């Protein structure tokens, strides 16, 4: 069995940047599932997983252009306090959701002022090259609800 479109890849992985910073891991004891051929997986990683067999172990280097794109300052925008809801204090590092026309976009605070805030929408994985040690634990067909999501 090999990866194919509309199939679900159950993934065990380790993510490190070019600087060696470990982002997060998914061990074989706790794999995670994603669709194939829909772009939810990182584009470089999605192309790497193409056609690989169950249990295959491989290491792939994914560049900044291949994952979330390069960091851009245009996505860093100032915003006042009144926009945020449901938080007592807008402490630095807090993350909020903005429902834009292009779908949901995570918003994270990078600087804070008593009555003013600065937020960054750039993904923490964007703007840095990545390397993935990846194993495909299992493969299966996606459910209709999963395809809907």
């Amino acid at each position: 069995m090999k990866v194919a479109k509309d199939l679900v890849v159950s993934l065990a992985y380790q993510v490190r940047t070019e600087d060696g910073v470990l982002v997060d891991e998914s061990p074989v004891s706790a794999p995670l599932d994603y669709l194939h051929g829909h772009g939810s997986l990182i584009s470089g990683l999605e192309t790497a997983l193409e056609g690989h067999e169950v249990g295959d172990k491989f290491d792939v280097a994914v560049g900044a252009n291949d994952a979330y794109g390069q960091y851009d300052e245009n996505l860093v925008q100032r915003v006042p306090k009144d926009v945020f809801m449901g938080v007592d204090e807008l402490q630095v590092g807090m993350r909020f959701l903005a429902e834009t026309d292009q779908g949901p976009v995570p918003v994270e605070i990078t600087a804070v002022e008593d009555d003013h805030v600065v937020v960054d929408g750039n993904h923490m994985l964007a703007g840095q090259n990545l390397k993935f040690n990846v194993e495909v634990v299992a493969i299966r067909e996606a459910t209709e609800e999963e395809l809907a999501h």
């Binding site: 100032r78 915003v79 006042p80 003013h116």
Partner: protein, 360 residues
């Protein structure tokens, strides 16, 4: 200044002979007026911020976006200075009509300046007393009209141009002074009234200035005047320069006065432009073209008068607001919508007025 300087410098270099051509003078007047307005804008606006509020302020973020807060008034001083500079640089100073336009424009500018200084610096919310304001307006307008009447009478300089009849051109006597007073003061007040919306007043003034530039070019040429059946005025030719300078200054101010305006025109600028349009429609015998092309201002004044008349006759009010533009704004129309729609109406009215000038 420059025109005479170039005329004298021709004997050294023949290239400057081009400067005497009317088209070149008009184009450079437009360009220099616009450039002066843009150059003085950012620095002049900052000066008014401190004078009017005591501190230089900016939105500095999403807050106060599409907000009129922190925007100085009295911005018409830049329009006045740009127009005066352009006219003096590129208009033949020997032309009496140019000087009459300059005199009325500067007088109305000074009146507006004193009114705005009373309103802002001294915090006199009521501003200059209406009695003295209108007294000075009437004095200057009547002086200009009387000077024109004495300088010209029993000639086409005082004949009335019916918008659609060429044979019906009555020769006005002392009634010419009354008509000049009426038109000048009405135009000044109406353009002053148009300041309810920030960007509303200037663009119709620009279109009317272009129309009057075309008329003056037609009025200044024997062949064109005969073809269009309009009075021939020797000094009307130079009014193209002042009309083009008005266009340039208005566009330069609108560059900064666009909604959300960085600076309001105030009584200055608006009143001066109204006086300039009135004196242009007096010097050029096409006052009906002022009435039609400037139909926006006339409609606004008539709307205010109708509102007050209805509020007197009955307890009801015809309009949501005495000015029609505010009436539409309160109805739900966003301010830029009203701005651009009134600009469209003004352009259509200018084209219609030119058509009426053509069909006679």
């Amino acid at each position: 200044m420059l025109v005479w300087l170039a005329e004298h410098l021709v004997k050294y270099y023949s290239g400057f002979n081009v400067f005497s051509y009317l088209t070149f003078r008009a184009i450079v007047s437009l360009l220099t007026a616009l450039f002066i307005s843009l150059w003085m804008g950012p620095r002049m606006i900052a000066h008014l911020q401190k004078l009017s509020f005591g501190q230089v302020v900016r939105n500095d973020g999403p807050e106060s976006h599409f907000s009129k807060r922190g925007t100085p008034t009295m911005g018409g001083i830049m329009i006045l200075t740009a127009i005066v500079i352009s006219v003096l640089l590129w208009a033949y100073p020997s032309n009496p009509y140019v000087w009459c336009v300059l005199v009325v424009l500067v007088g109305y500018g000074v009146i507006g300046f004193v009114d705005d200084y009373r309103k802002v610096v001294r915090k006199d919310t009521k501003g200059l007393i209406a009695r003295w304001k209108y007294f000075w307006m009437s004095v200057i307008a009547l002086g200009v009209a009387f000077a024109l009447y004495l300088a010209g009478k029993d000639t086409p300089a005082t004949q009335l141009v019916v918008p659609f009849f060429k044979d019906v051109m009555p020769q006005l006597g002392l009634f010419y002074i009354l008509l000049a007073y009426f038109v000048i003061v009405g135009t000044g007040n109406a353009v002053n009234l148009t300041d309810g919306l920030d960007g509303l007043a200037i663009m119709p003034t620009v279109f009317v200035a272009g129309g009057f530039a075309l008329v003056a070019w037609a009025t200044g040429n024997m062949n064109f005047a005969s073809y269009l059946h309009i009075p021939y005025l020797r000094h009307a030719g130079e009014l193209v320069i002042v009309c083009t300078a008005i266009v340039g200054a208005g566009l330069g101010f609108l560059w900064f006065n666009t909604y959300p305006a960085q600076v309001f025109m105030g009584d200055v600028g608006s009143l001066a432009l109204g006086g300039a349009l009135g004196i242009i429609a007096v010097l050029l015998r096409q006052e009906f073209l002022l009435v039609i092309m400037g139909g926006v201002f006339v409609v606004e004044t008539l709307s205010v008068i109708l509102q007050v008349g209805s509020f007197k006759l009955r307890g009801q009010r015809i309009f949501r607001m005495a000015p029609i533009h505010h009436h539409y704004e309160l109805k739900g129309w966003p301010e830029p919508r009203v701005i651009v729609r009134f600009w469209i109406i003004s352009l259509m009215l200018v084209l219609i007025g030119l058509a009426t000038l053509k069909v006679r």
